[PDB]
RNA sequence: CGGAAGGGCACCACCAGGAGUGGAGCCUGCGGCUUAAUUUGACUCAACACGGGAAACCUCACCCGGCCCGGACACGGACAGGAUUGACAGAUUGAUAGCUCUUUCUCGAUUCCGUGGGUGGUGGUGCAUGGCCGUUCUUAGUUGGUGGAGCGAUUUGUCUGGUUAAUUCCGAUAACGAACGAGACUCUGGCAUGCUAACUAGUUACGCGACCCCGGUCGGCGUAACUUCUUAGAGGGACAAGUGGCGUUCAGCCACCCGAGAUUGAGCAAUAACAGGUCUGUGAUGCCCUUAGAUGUCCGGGGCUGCACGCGCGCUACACUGACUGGCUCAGCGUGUGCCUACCCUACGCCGGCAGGCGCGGGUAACCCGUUGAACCCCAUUCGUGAUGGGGAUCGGGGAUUGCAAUUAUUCCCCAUGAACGAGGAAUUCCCAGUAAGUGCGGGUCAUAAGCUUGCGUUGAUUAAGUCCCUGCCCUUUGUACACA
């Protein structure tokens, strides 16, 4: 068959090293904290986190969304 | 094939608990009737049991619209140490 | 105390040999039995084009399947006639037993 | 999403809903008395099921 | 094979006829044109209402777009400091396909990347095939063994004659003994007042009820006999048996008595074949093609219905032997609540002109639909030879049902529109007794569903008991320069 444009490009995973570094408070004072928001998910109580953008929060396993 | 390993060990668990496996030729029907305890479609699979066939662990026959698969002695030895079963955990094939 | 069996099959001679050797036993078990009452026989007809494709003379098979069925009544207690339900059975006949 | 869309089309009716119970074929089906097998497969299996041509 | 001869045969031949068809409108298939695609197979019998092919989607194989891997397995790679799943917004899309784009999250060895290979295909090849079907070919034909005749291919048996539906028999006989086909066979139709039996079939009695005038009607209600009607089993029955002619007095034929039947209709169907059809029935299948930007598969839309022409199968008709409107009165086959699987057949009450709808019930069925109140036919009205109240194409407006969705109108209704068509050229099809023909009802197809097909009844003939003229078939003899004939 003939075609029209070049093929629609597949979504690529942007390779980031240590993808947990956006999340926790590491300092010489003996503290630990969370940068992003914890999920209010019923099935995932306090395990994982949201996708804090500048616009809205997203958690993955529950597909949860809380905007502003 | 992509599938949870939980669905995968439920399939091999049924293949152990009765040493055969039957599936209607349907890659569209929502769920296996015997395996209604798990969220496993016939779409979610018959081709992995073909994978056991193509590795040599089951032998396949295909009547009218229904696959049938049979466990082998080559297959039981692999599957028990895939599902981390001892020699004490055996099918109806090893027991009277 | 009044039971009724329905004998249903496709082959009439092995239906009516069961339907006779049950009645012969029922008359020597000192009962009051009504004999075979014969329902009209259900012939199942399928007319089909013989050719797998659409070529040739338009020829048709007229396949048939005749199903025969009897009623036998027993004015008898149950275990007095529960032998003949599970004895004198041949692999062709289905039995449908009712009481009420 | 493909997983919630691959089997959302309603084939609850039509001849796409049905197939031969020997062939998985969609034409020549005999639904009479629930045979649900195509005309040529029924030609193959009519004596085996018990339909004798005597007329 | 013969536009050679002899003997027979067949309404896919003819005669005598019947209904037609070919003429018109429409349906539907085919060709052609057109188109993004108008998918394709089949082209004398033996393609052309065929592929069970009545396609809105699906089907679907065609076309225009967009997803998915549903690429097993092996090897090497990356890979828990993450191989990779999935995604709400907002763009984008046709779309609530995270299909992609920007943003980040989630998921956790199930994967992915390559390399070999595999899988799938309504892709091709029926001129590679199997199976099935059709056809030669509905006629009577075909073949061994042993023996005989020929160098042989071959021939005889398998035939001069009579006879038969028949290579069916008698008979003849270098053949004898056989095998298939034919016949026999199974189903079906017709017949039993004798058998078996019947609260899921009834009949007759008797009791009661209702209406009329002791009786009559009642599919109104109920129980003592019986199986005539019904059901379906066992048997019986019919054999050219009996009589009279014809006949080698054989094989057999004609007519008649007695009787239900003195020829019911099918099914199965030999050897050899055919480049017949089917790869689009198949997880029957060789080879080839293709395999992630797919000829896999899915979704959305469209096409298969497209329209200067030609053809085939059909339906409606061209009217008074009819139409319309009332009344009356009779069937036989069936099918029916589904492994997936949603979709059954309907009694009856009420609302609605109508299609329909809203409620309770029965039936997995000789139980309910149902006593299947079918049509044609029959009796009574109105018409009046007028393209008329024949005919109902085309087209307009509205109303219901099925469906996720009906527009290129799914189907059904209502009103209105009221075309050709005045019995069809050359030509040509099917058929002889419950036959043709008319007439409706089932089944299949079916969510909605018959102008088709397969069955069933109902009403029911004209003509024929023959021939080889036409078209073909069989046998023998004969001729041949034919032998893919
Ligand atoms: Mg004749
Ligand atoms: Mg004539
Ligand atoms: Mg015409
Ligand atoms: Mg249609
Ligand atoms: Mg589609
Ligand atoms: Mg379509
Ligand atoms: Mg295929
Ligand atoms: Mg062929
Ligand atoms: Mg050919
Ligand atoms: Mg078409
Ligand atoms: Mg007029
Ligand atoms: Mg009219
Ligand atoms: Mg002719
Ligand atoms: Mg048709
Ligand atoms: Mg000469
Ligand atoms: Zn089939």
Curated annotation (Swiss-Prot), chain A:
Localization annotation: Cytoplasm; Nucleus, Nucleolus
Cross-link Glycyl lysine isopeptide (Lys-Gly) (interchain with G-Cter in ubiquitin) - where? 25, 31
Coiled-coil stretches noted in the UniProt entry, renumbered to this chain: none
Q: How is it modified after translation?
A: Monoubiquitinated at Lys-25 and Lys-31 by RNF25 in response to ribosome collisions (ribosome stalling): ubiquitination promotes subsequent activation of RNF14, leading to EEF1A1 ubiquitination and degradation and rescue of stalled ribosomes. Deubiquitination at Lys-31 by USP16 is required for maturation of the 40S ribosomal complex.
Which N-terminal stretch is annotated as signal sequence?
none
Zn finger limits (C4-type)? 39-62
Ranges for the region named Disordered are 1-13
Q: Which residues carry this modification: N6-acetyllysine?
A: 22, 31
Q: How does it assemble?
A: Part of the 40S ribosomal subunit. Part of the small subunit (SSU) processome, composed of more than 70 proteins and the RNA chaperone small nucleolar RNA (snoRNA) U3.
Q: What does this protein do?
A: Component of the 40S subunit of the ribosome. Part of the small subunit (SSU) processome, first precursor of the small eukaryotic ribosomal subunit. During the assembly of the SSU processome in the nucleolus, many ribosome biogenesis factors, an RNA chaperone and ribosomal proteins associate with the nascent pre-rRNA and work in concert to generate RNA folding, modifications, rearrangements and cleavage as well as targeted degradation of pre-ribosomal RNA by the RNA exosome.
Name of the protein described by the UniProt record? Small ribosomal subunit protein eS31
UniProt lists the gene as RPS27A
Residue window of the full protein shown:
83 to 150 of 156
UniProtKB/Swiss-Prot annotation, chain D:
Q: Give the N6-acetyllysine positions (modified residues).
A: 47
Q: Tell me which cofactor or cofactors this protein depends on.
A: Zn(2+)
| Gene Ontology CC | cytosolic ribosome; cytosolic small ribosomal subunit; rough endoplasmic reticulum
GO terms (BP aspect): cytoplasmic translation
Recorded GO MF terms? structural constituent of ribosome; zinc ion binding
Disulphides? none
Asked if Acetylation is a keyword of the record, the answer is yes
Give the keywords, sorted: Acetylation, Cytoplasm, Endoplasmic reticulum, Metal-binding, Methylation, Phosphoprotein, Ribonucleoprotein, Ribosomal protein, Zinc
- Going by the entry's taxonomy, the superkingdom of the source organism is recorded as Eukaryota
List-wise, which residues carry Omega-N-methylarginine?
11
Phosphoserine modification sites? 8
Localisation per UniProt entry: Cytoplasm, Cytosol; Cytoplasm; Rough endoplasmic reticulum
**Residues at which Zn(2+) binds:** 20, 23, 38, 41
Q: How is its cofactor bound, per UniProt?
A: Binds 1 zinc ion per subunit.
Coiled-coil spans are none
Q: Tell me where the signal peptide lies.
A: none
Q: Which Pfam families match?
A: Ribosomal_S14 (PF00253)
Q: Does the keyword Nucleotidyltransferase apply?
A: no
- Which NCBIfam families does the protein's record reference? PRK05766.1
| Assembly, per entry | Component of the 40S small ribosomal subunit.
Of which family is this protein a member?
A: Belongs to the universal ribosomal protein uS14 family.
Function in brief:
Component of the small ribosomal subunit. The ribosome is a large ribonucleoprotein complex responsible for the synthesis of proteins in the cell.
Name of the protein described by the UniProt record? Small ribosomal subunit protein uS14
Q: Tell me the organism's taxonomic lineage.
A: Eukaryota, Metazoa, Chordata, Craniata, Vertebrata
């Amino acid at each position: 068959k003939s075609y029209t444009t070049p093929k629609k490009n597949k979504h690529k995973r942007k390779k980031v090293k240590l993808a947990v570094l956006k999340y926790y408070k590491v300092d010489e004072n003996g503290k630990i904290s969370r940068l992003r928001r914890e999920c209010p998910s019923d099935e995932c109580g306090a395990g994982v986190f949201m996708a804090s953008h500048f616009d809205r929060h997203y958690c993955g396993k529950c597909c949860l969304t809380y905007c502003f | 094939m992509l599938m949870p390993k939980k669905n995968r060990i439920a399939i091999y668990e049924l293949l152990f608990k009765e040493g055969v496996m039957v599936a209607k030729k349907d890659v569209h029907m929502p769920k296996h009737p015997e395996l209604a305890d798990k969220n496993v479609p016939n779409l979610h699979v018959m081709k992995a049991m073909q994978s056991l066939k193509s590795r040599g662990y089951v032998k396949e026959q295909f009547a009218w619209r229904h696959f049938y698969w049979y466990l082998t002695n080559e297959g039981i030895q692999y599957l028990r140490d895939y599902l981390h079963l001892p020699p004490e955990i055996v099918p109806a094939t090893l027991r009277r | 105390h009044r039971i009724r069996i329905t004998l249903t099959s496709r082959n009439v001679k092995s239906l009516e040999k069961v339907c006779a050797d049950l009645i012969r036993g029922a008359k020597e078990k000192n009962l009051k039995v009504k004999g075979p009452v014969r329902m009209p026989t259900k012939t199942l007809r399928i007319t089909t084009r013989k050719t797998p494709c659409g070529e040739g003379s338009k020829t048709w098979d007229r396949f048939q399947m005749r199903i025969h069925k009897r009623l036998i009544d027993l004015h008898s207690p149950s275990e007095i006639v529960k032998q003949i339900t599970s004895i004198s059975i041949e692999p062709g006949v289905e039995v449908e037993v009712t009481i009420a | 999403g493909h997983q919630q869309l691959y089997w959302s089309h309603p084939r609850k009716f039509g001849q796409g809903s049905r197939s031969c119970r020997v062939c998985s074929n969609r034409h020549g089906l005999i639904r009479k008395y629930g045979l649900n097998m195509c005309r040529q497969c029924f030609r193959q299996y009519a004596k085996d099921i018990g339909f004798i041509k005597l007329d």
